[PDB]
Amino acid sequence: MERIKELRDLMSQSRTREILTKTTVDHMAIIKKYTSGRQEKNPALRMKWMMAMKYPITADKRIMEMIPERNEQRQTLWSKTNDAGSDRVMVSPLAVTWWNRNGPTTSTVHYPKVYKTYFEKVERLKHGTFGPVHFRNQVKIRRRVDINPGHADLSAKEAQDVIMEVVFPNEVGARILTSESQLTITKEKKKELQDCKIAPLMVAYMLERELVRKTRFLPVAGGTSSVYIEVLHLTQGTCWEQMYTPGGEVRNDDVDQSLIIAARNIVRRATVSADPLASLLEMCHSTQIGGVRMVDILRQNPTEEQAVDICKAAMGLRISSSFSFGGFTFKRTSGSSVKREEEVLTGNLQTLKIRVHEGYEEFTMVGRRATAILRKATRRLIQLIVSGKDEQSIAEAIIVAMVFSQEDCMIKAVRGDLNFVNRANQRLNPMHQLLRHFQKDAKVLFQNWGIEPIDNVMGMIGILPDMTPSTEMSLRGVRVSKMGVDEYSSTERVVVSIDRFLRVRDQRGNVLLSPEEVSETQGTEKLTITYSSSMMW
Amino acid sequence: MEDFVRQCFNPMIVELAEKAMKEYGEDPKIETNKFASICTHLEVCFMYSDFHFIDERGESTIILKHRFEIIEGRDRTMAWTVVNSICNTTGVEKPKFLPDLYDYKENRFIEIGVTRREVHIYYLEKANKIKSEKTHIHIFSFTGEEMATKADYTLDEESRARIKTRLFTIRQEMASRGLWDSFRQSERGEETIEERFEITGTMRRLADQSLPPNFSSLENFRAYVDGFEPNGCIEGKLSQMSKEVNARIEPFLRTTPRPLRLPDGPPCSQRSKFLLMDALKLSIEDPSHEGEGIPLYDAIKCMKTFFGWKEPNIIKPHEKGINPNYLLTWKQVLAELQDIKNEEKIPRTKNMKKTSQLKWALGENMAPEKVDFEDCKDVNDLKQYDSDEPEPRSLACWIQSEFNKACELTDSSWVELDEIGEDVAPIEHIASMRRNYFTAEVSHCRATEYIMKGVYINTALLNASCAAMDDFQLIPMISKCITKEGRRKTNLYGFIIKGRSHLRNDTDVVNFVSMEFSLTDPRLEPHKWEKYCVLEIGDMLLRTAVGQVSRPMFLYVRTNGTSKIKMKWGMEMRRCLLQSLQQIESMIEAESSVKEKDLTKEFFENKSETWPIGESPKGVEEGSIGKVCRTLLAKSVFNSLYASPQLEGFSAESRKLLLIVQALRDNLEPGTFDLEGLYEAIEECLINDPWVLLNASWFNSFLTHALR
Amino acid sequence: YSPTSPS
Amino acid sequence: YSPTSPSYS
Amino acid sequence: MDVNPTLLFLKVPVQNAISTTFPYTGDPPYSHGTGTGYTMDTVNRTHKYSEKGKWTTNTETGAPQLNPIDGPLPEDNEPSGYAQTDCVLEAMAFLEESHPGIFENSCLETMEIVQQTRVDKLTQGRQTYDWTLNRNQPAATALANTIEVFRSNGLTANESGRLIDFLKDVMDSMDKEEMEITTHGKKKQRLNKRSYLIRALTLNTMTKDAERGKLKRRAIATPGMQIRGFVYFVEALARSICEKLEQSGLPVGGNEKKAKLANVVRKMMTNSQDTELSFTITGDNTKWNENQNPRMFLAMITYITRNQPEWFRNVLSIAPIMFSNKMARLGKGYMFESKSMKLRTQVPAEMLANIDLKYFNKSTREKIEKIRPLLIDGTASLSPGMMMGMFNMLSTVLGVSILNLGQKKYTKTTYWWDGLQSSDDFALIVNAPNHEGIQAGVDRFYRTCKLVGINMSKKKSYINRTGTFEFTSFFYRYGFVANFSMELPSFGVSGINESADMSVGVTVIKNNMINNDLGPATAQMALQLFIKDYRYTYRCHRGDTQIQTRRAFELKKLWEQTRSKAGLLVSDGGPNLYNIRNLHIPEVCLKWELMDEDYQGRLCNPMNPFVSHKEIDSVNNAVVMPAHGPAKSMEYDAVATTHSWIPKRNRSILNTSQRGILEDEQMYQKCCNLFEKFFPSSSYRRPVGISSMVEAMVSRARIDARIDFESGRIKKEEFAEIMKICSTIEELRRQ
RNA sequence: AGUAGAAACAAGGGUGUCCCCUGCUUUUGCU
Ligand SMILES: [Mg+2]
């Protein structure tokens, strides 16, 4: 009614008639931003200067008929003069205060339901529990965390479609929501937001902020989680740690852990299967985590885990180009190498057929408990800078790096035959055979590896073969960095191919992931996991 | 056939059809069988929808409600919007693809088709393409055949007959043109078009003129680059290059660095916006917080507390000014204060009369008239604005004394921080106690008094400048403090008269006349007060320990100026605190990360740890953590008060020399490529600023002390 | 806390 | 005395 | 006892007290008058560093251009611009060899980018030069003016909305024999081919303000709308290339830069007892943007885009060509004064070509005499250099290539080098068995840089054992130390509005705690100071206080009216409940449970007139200018309330002849606002449609009326009335 | 005079001493 009346009044005038009748809808995106107002170049100075004026604020014309011209003290609240470049009217902050003390009161019941993110933040803080303060040297590792607890891991486009359906139902267009999770979210939000007077744009913005996973590269000192990073300023410090437990659980962490557990179990059961590829594909399409089919989670969940990467690549999707060895992810930094096949003899008089890498190279190795950077030459180790939570993690990192170096010094350190097999009773490749053998025990290797003196430099320390810190002695090219060795930020997503044995090979042919690289650790699921396939029965 | 189709349809129908086919990006002059098919579809659909209304009860109507809603012949956006709205409101699920129209009587979507082929073939094709069971499908034939779902025809027999007749007559017309046989409809193939971006004309010439010297065309350069393989080019050119092009490392040893060369000239003079060490305040015990009462009433009360007013007389005249004007300005201020006193009503602000003395002192009508160049090109003395370097000044000994006095402790607290949320976490309790220590050490520092005075003065100046740009406004210099006995005091330093303040640019200047009380005789350090006209306005009987001693009380009167940017940055001087405190905090925390405990209490209550912070004739002097905090606070405050591009340049250049000296101290074997250039860059920033000169002198002292 | 300095 | 915040009765 | 804070460095290492050396509590230097002198000095310096080049007269613009590419090799250590094409090509080839497939994949990604980017992407600029108005205008306004002028001149390929189509329109307009423009009393002006060509290649020069650490002001340039798209595509390609290089510090943030620097430093430093020395250079290049040549960038792009479609190569190549044929405006001009007559006047820079030299002083006279040969149509011809310097990512690629040339397989010597590069800045590390090898490696790097046109500032650089260094004000001393002063200007009232300012202050404190090692007590005192400054700026002191302000009466009345005082916002005289634990909570939600029902309903009333919602991209988004670097976008968490108002704009334009645009602007808003009343989603996702505004509006009105009537929410009389009105509008559209 | 520093402010426009308009808008780039 009033819309057509406004359109008629607009069509009355000639210039605006031409503007309306000669500009296409696409041109709206440009002419609406058309403005003579230069972007402010010193907002602080401008605000300090303008708050000393009489009418610094702008308000809609309705304010004229909504609040009185003058206050009880004859203090003017709004002025008739229009704001430059619009029909808004200049008004004073006294007008805002008068509104707050005398304006039309309205029931605010959807606000907690619309701004759910902030209210969840405050509830989590209120229900949290604190602990003691530990004054000690703090080791901070820079890691890519996700500062957005409580989101439904919906991408930009799916989030946009859900927001369009919820807030602007008639403008959905040609898209029909398919994933039952999206339908559930849409129906829920439509029910909660029914009869909501808040401006549609703010509701859409809040839904987008709540449903999309954000990320930042931050120096985390302790645990990583959407609820622990959120309160990072209050937990970690330069020289102190504040023990704290947020008073709330977030479904995203639950689904992440449950997906990790399910992928690990499914790959473990697929290794034994006669057809690992077909069995893995069937298990992927025939399982549910917390009422959600795993196929939908996999295409959207960005969590990184060898089992998760194997499952994601099985159906066919881009994965990180860094290769998995010994439970560590290796991302190449500089240099290059060529694969040369060779034969080698161990200290137990056994022939091993290995594929050595010839050439200078640099890698960054990231593990669950420790991380390092490795400068490696052809069949020789140049440098290994490592840092871990505790001594055992550093030991595991050093072992995997030493095995990866392919040096003959650790080859002749082998004692006994290498007869390691997988769960399916199949012989492993020589590299993983050596890795397992040295993981069982490493006294001989660490003793029979080498010893060289070092320079005492701050932030660095040595390790002896018995794995005790030293200040004047260390191994060959191995140094423990007291300060956390920062991990990589971005990893290239590349096409890969998977054979019938779940060995993931890239275009160059090198193997990135394999079931033998999946950890044997078994945790407790946070969400109920159900398997509809015949094998898991 | 284009004429046959165009002339045999309603202009609106052809317009809709052509717009619809253009929406896909096709060329109407190229594909026309599609055009004919879509135009026939539009015509049949319009006949289907037209001549059909619904009355109030919901029955048919043949000549208000429209029985049929059209979907074809519309932009994809509008069609999708209308179908989505219909599906939402009616409840019928929307189809995957776009139907042709919608019917309200039966409340379902119906598809219309016109095909030369038999009805069954196209019916099956469309039905198995859309794959919908709740949408009607109606197929027409050029030969009169027609069929809908379950053989159920929605439209009346008369409407179907009319549609068939229209189709038959248009087919007869097309056959009369003879192209009916060679029509065979047309289907959408969704072609893909490769991109192209050609460089031709003027731009090709520009490209040909934007290549290395040896190439004449862009194509030749492209061919050369594509067929390029690295063949010792860099190595050959390195061999060819002269050996004089090298980066020779100069060893930086303990005997390498030399003291900075300070500029020579007349001694530097005071340039702050208010007195710092010589300020005298008249105080009254008033139980009010910062910025509570009326400034003018407080000023009058403070003035009342002083007896011993004397007839003003020039003591130290302004060399380049008109001192009688300053005397008259002070007399006028006194008279106006008396007038407001004998009024029984104190307004928030007072506007001074625009007398001749204030007109001169505040730079009234000093801007040259603005004229067009064509009107004054023949003027003999018309020339460019003076843009020479500022005259050089030598460092004077008063700036060091100012800094020394700014680092002292005061008998009154100067900062009353606001409240914050209550402590709930142990780390918050530790932070609260640490901040209590900090604010205790900082609340009684003269630098904090300078911070508060500057913030108040700049805030008042900015507010007055914005509020009254055309009036000479009087502003008292007022501060609030708490004595060591806990009694609140309001102090008056002096007065400021703000002139016209039509400030447009952030660098535009507003002039003001500042008259401040003091007890220091200017004649002891005349060079420091070259910009001032100092008067004597009384003899104060100071209360010393032995007894009472009478001393003259002087009024330092000067003309100063400030810009919007300077006032704004003076309003934010409080953040200076943060700087110092941050530096202090990191110093404690670092030492607390080795002892596994908080040493804040130890540092602040035992004074066992000291840092070298000053210089004495015996050597380097060390101070406590509180002294270090006060010194850093004073340095930050003086940086705020004496900001200038010279300070920025000196800081930036001397940072590198400090880092090089530190590397030498760390035994890292530093080396320089051009140390003389660095020294020249540092020295170019020392011209006349007393603060920068003092910083350079400090650097020289540190250099002497850090290399032995 | 009552700040104090030797000077 | 203090040449900034003295006492003058 | 004389207090000397510098002496503190005798005990605390300089890095550990580096914040003491940053005087960022005072105002930064500002330019007061014209920038013409700096621009002329820049042009003369650019033509002096490459004066041993080939002089050519452009056939199109008729301008004198200087070509130093493949010129005489340097013979001294002064800045040089004689880059060698083959050396640059070899550097690019070796960069490709070190990272095979980098160029191909980056080209594919950027090519996918090109076909999808929209013309509206150009609106996210800042004060673009407007050749139509011949002055700086906001990016969106400049784009709209350019589109209108193109349309009036029969250049309508940009209706498709693709940026590449707009580039095709620019290409075609370049060949037009006559351009028609409209100048405000609308008047028509005709520009010949050469005039329009010079206008399209012009850069508006001004002076930079609020720069720290410099004693002398310097000039910056801003291009027009004719070159923005080409530069955007070139920068997208450069960004794609840089992302894949471990030695490139762009476009990653501070944390990633610190991680990369730590990784490289630890990699190089660590060695056994005595096998090789490592020395880090904290280098800095001199006249970086005055010695880089657009021709070298063209060679780099040509090599990068090998074995690619021709159209892609042309699109990527247009930008270097335009930059090679650029012209620079000489600022506002000068101001003359007369003491005897007490007069002042403005002399436009357009007149400097033939003005008497008796007015100017010695230095300005010399500058004018030196630059006179290059002047054309009031603009100076500047072929060499990169004055504007908007190729910040290709220069990073060149620096990374020079760094990568330091591998042991490329030096073929005992010495080698590695490090990080960030456009102009760079940190180097050279490893060699002895000091002689270190000197040899440093000399090799310096000479290669000279060959590639990069000049290292020997005055601003030093070398020391690789334990401590600096990089873009990040100070590393066996680990990165805190530099709090760098962020000091961020601690204050941002100046957006009450709610946004509170949110931004709290967030800034939280982030400086997380990243810059801000102490707990320092954070608490920063909160106290921010609350004080906020209260004073917005005159929202506590209701019970006796502070005299224009807003005191209303706040006092609201305070006495309220029952639960702890629920009021600080903007309404409420108390401050923020502390370290809850620095991540918006204020409205922080004290939601303590607010009165009436006050809560009034404050959170979606029917208030003070809240205006623009496109979603600006929701809870603010522009913040840091102490160093360009302005950034910051997202803050806040609930939209009556305190989210918008401050008034500048009205000076009302007194000029450009006021016509103001009126025009208002008209647009009306239409745009009306569109929102028919397409409420239009503010969330940009609508698309070729039909006119009126057609879509009338169609939607018809459908909405029909649907609402069928739903029974409107009586037939109202539906008939609106149907009649819509018919009236539809018929009035034809006439 | 004063601010200030490589160029500026010390009000600028408008209309016929009053009145009207303006306080970033002939000048603030780029990842
Ligand atoms: Mg630099």
TrEMBL record, chain A:
Keyword Protein biosynthesis: no
Gene Ontology MF: a single term: RNA-directed RNA polymerase activity
Annotated ranges, domain Influenza RNA polymerase PB2 N-terminal region: 1-36
Any single Gene Ontology cellular-component annotation: virion component
Compartments reported by the entry: Host mitochondrion; Virion; Host nucleus
Residue ranges occupied by any Influenza RNA polymerase PB2 middle domain in the UniProt entry: 107-248
Domain Influenza RNA polymerase PB2 second: 37-104
Keywords of the record: Cap snatching, Eukaryotic host gene expression shutoff by virus, Eukaryotic host transcription shutoff by virus, Host gene expression shutoff by virus, Host nucleus, Host-virus interaction, Inhibition of host RNA polymerase II by virus, mRNA capping, mRNA processing, Viral transcription, Virion
Every Influenza RNA polymerase PB2 CAP binding domain range: 320-530
The Polymerase basic protein 2 helical domain, residue ranges: 250-319
Function field: Plays an essential role in transcription initiation and cap-stealing mechanism, in which cellular capped pre-mRNAs are used to generate primers for viral transcription. Recognizes and binds the 7-methylguanosine-containing cap of the target pre-RNA which is subsequently cleaved after 10-13 nucleotides by the viral protein PA. Plays a role in the initiation of the viral genome replication and modulates the activity of the ribonucleoprotein (RNP) complex.
Subunit structure: Influenza RNA polymerase is composed of three subunits: PB1, PB2 and PA. Interacts (via N-terminus) with PB1 (via C-terminus). Interacts with nucleoprotein NP (via N-terminus).
Family of this protein: Belongs to the influenza viruses PB2 family.
Protein name, entry field: Polymerase basic protein 2
Natural source organism: Influenza A virus
Lineage, highest ranks first: Viruses, Riboviria, Orthornavirae, Negarnaviricota, Polyploviricotina
Gene symbol of the encoding locus: PB2
Portion of the parent chain present: 1 to 537 of 759
TrEMBL record, chain B:
Alphabetized GO MF terms: endonuclease activity; hydrolase activity; metal ion binding; RNA binding
Tagged with keyword Acyltransferase: no
Ligand binding (Mn(2+) 2): 72, 100
Cofactor note: Binds 2 manganese ions per subunit.
Keywords annotated in UniProt: Cap snatching, Endonuclease, Eukaryotic host gene expression shutoff by virus, Eukaryotic host transcription shutoff by virus, Host cytoplasm, Host gene expression shutoff by virus, Host nucleus, Host-virus interaction, Hydrolase, Inhibition of host RNA polymerase II by virus, Manganese, Metal-binding, Nuclease, Phosphoprotein
Motif (Nuclear localization signal 2 (NLS2)): 176-239
InterPro entries in UniProt: INFV_PA (IPR037534), PA/PA-X (IPR001009), PA/PA-X_sf (IPR038372)
Modification note: Phosphorylated on serines and threonines by host kinases, including human casein kinase II.
A Pfam family this chain is assigned to: Flu_PA
Highest taxon of source: Viruses
Residues the entry annotates as binding Mg(2+) 3: 72, 100, 111
Keyword match Phosphoprotein: yes
Residues reported in the UniProt entry to bind Mg(2+) 2: 72, 100
Function: Plays an essential role in viral RNA transcription and replication by forming the heterotrimeric polymerase complex together with PB1 and PB2 subunits. The complex transcribes viral mRNAs by using a unique mechanism called cap-snatching. It consists in the hijacking and cleavage of host capped pre-mRNAs. These short capped RNAs are then used as primers for viral mRNAs. The PB2 subunit is responsible for the binding of the 5' cap of cellular pre-mRNAs which are subsequently cleaved after 10-13 nucleotides by the PA subunit that carries the endonuclease activity.
Similarity comment: Belongs to the influenza viruses PA family.
Subunit structure: Influenza RNA polymerase is composed of three subunits: PB1, PB2 and PA. Interacts (via C-terminus) with PB1 (via N-terminus).
Record's protein name: Polymerase acidic protein
Organism this protein belongs to: Influenza A virus
Gene from which the chain derives: PA
UniProtKB/TrEMBL annotation, chain E:
Gene3D superfamilies: 6.10.140.720
Annotated Mg(2+) 2 binding sites: 284-285, 424
Annotated coiled-coil segments of the chain: none
Chief localisation class: host cell
PROSITE patterns in the cross-refs: RDRP_SSRNA_NEG_SEG
UniProt PTM comment: Phosphorylated by host PRKCA.
Keywords: Eukaryotic host gene expression shutoff by virus, Eukaryotic host transcription shutoff by virus, Host cytoplasm, Host gene expression shutoff by virus, Host nucleus, Host-virus interaction, Inhibition of host RNA polymerase II by virus, Metal-binding, Nucleotide-binding, Nucleotidyltransferase, Phosphoprotein, RNA-directed RNA polymerase, Transferase, Viral RNA replication, Viral transcription
One Gene Ontology term, aspect cellular component: host cell nucleus
Motif mapping: Nuclear localization signal: 185-195
Role noted for this protein: RNA-dependent RNA polymerase which is responsible for replication and transcription of virus RNA segments. The transcription of viral mRNAs occurs by a unique mechanism called cap-snatching. 5' methylated caps of cellular mRNAs are cleaved after 10-13 nucleotides by PA. In turn, these short capped RNAs are used as primers by PB1 for transcription of viral mRNAs. During virus replication, PB1 initiates RNA synthesis and copy vRNA into complementary RNA (cRNA) which in turn serves as a template for the production of more vRNAs.
Family: Belongs to the influenza viruses polymerase PB1 family.
Stated name of the protein: RNA-directed RNA polymerase catalytic subunit
Source organism: Influenza A virus (A/Zhejiang/DTID-ZJU01/2013(H7N9))
Lineage, uppermost ranks: Viruses, Riboviria, Orthornavirae, Negarnaviricota, Polyploviricotina
